[PDB]
Amino acid sequence: MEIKRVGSQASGKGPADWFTGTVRIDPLFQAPDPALVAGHSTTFEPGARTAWHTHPLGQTLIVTAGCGWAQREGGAVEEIHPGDVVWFSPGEKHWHGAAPTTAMTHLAIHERLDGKAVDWMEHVTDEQYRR
Amino acid sequence: MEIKRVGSQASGKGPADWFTGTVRIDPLFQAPDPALVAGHSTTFEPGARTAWHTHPLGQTLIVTAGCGWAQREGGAVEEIHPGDVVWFSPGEKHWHGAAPTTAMTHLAIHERLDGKAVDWMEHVTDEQYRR
Ligand SMILES: [Mn+2]
Ligand SMILES: [Mn+2]
């Protein structure tokens, strides 16, 4: 049994390669072998969002605060709210982040496949960032 | 990309064989093969807790409301509070629940191994719950 107490993990920032705007990453866990799951919290300032990317075994999002936007390639831009659970499929190309006037926070959970849980791709343009 | 909206997954009740007291289960997700990860929210009313049990691939908790207790076998009873992250090893026998006078809600994340994410065992006695 191991307990990581609230406040004991330092907050970080989202690398400018992988996010447009100001984004905070709050780590939570990464199960050790032979389990593969990891997770963390991510807070997006208004207008901020991930770049396009995919996950090798998909990813689950549990929105925990605010109001955000998300979109897979070919899909419409959807608004997401606290309590909504979002599932992206393996290899599914997508982004997510805040809405233009409100931040958003969600818990993200994904399994690692031989070490890897993400593949980053191009930024979401201001033309894409609209609804 | 699939969104399950807040309010779309009905609450259910913890079965008597797996819980002492009143427990509510709010489903969150189960990822389709080849992803093995699953998760749900559980709300324990004061005094309610799981029976003792184990998880084949361990379990991670993220407490989201109230104030609860948890224990692994041979271990002390520990308080867990919102924002705390708890990790139980694969195979580790344990239980968790509300404190005697406060409810607690957490998010539980576990990998399945052959479509099984838990082995249920004997109830936690009043004597084990306090002392
Ligand atoms: Mn993602
Ligand atoms: Mn458990």
- HEC string for chain A: CEEECCCCCCCEECCCCCEECCEEEEEEEECCCCCCEEEEEEEECCCCEECCEECCCCEEEEEEEECEEEEECCCCCEEECCCCEEEECCCCCEEEEECCCCCEEEEEEEECECCECCEECCCCCCCCCCC
Helix (H) or strand (E) holding B41: strand B37-44
Which chain A residues are within 8 Å of B90, Cβ to Cβ?
34-35
* Residue B96 marked in a binding site: yes
Q: Which of B29, B83, B84 sits opposite A87 (nearest CB)?
A: B29
Q: Are A87 and B111 a contacting pair at CB < 8 A?
A: no
**Of B113, B65, B70, B52, residue with least CA distance to A31:** B113
Q: Is the CB of residue A36 less than 8 Å away from at least one CB of chain B?
A: yes
Q: Is the CB of residue B74 less than 8 Å away from at least one CB of chain A?
A: no
> Distances from the Cα of B59 to the Cαs of A99, A106, A121, A126, in angstroms?
33, 20, 32, 40
Which chain B residues are within 8 Å of A29, Cβ to Cβ?
60, 85, 87
Do the strands B59-66 and B85-88 form a parallel or antiparallel pair, or are they unpaired? antiparallel
Cβ-contact A60, B4 below 8 angstroms? no
Which chain B residues are within 8 Å of A62, Cβ to Cβ?
28-29, 39, 107
Q: Are B5 and A84 a contacting pair at CB < 8 A?
A: yes
Which chain B residues are within 8 Å of A60, Cβ to Cβ?
28-29, 31, 37, 39
Which-ligand-closest: CA of A88?
1
Name the structure determination technique.
Answer: X-ray
CATH 3.40.50.300 fits A1-131, yes or no: no
Cβ-contact B78, B87 below 8 angstroms? no
**Of A19, A51, A5, residue with least CA distance to B78:** A5
To one decimal, the resolution in angstroms is 2.1
B32 vs A107: CA distance, rounded Å: 19
B86 vs B62: CA distance, rounded Å: 6
Cβ-contact B122, B52 below 8 angstroms? yes
Q: How far is the CA of A89 from the centre of ligand 1 (A)?
A: 10
Q: How far is B4 from chain A (nearest CA, A)?
A: 5
Which-ligand-closest: CA of B88?
2
**Of A32, A71, A26, residue with least CA distance to A53:** A71
Q: How far is the CA of A119 from the centre of ligand 1 (A)?
A: 10
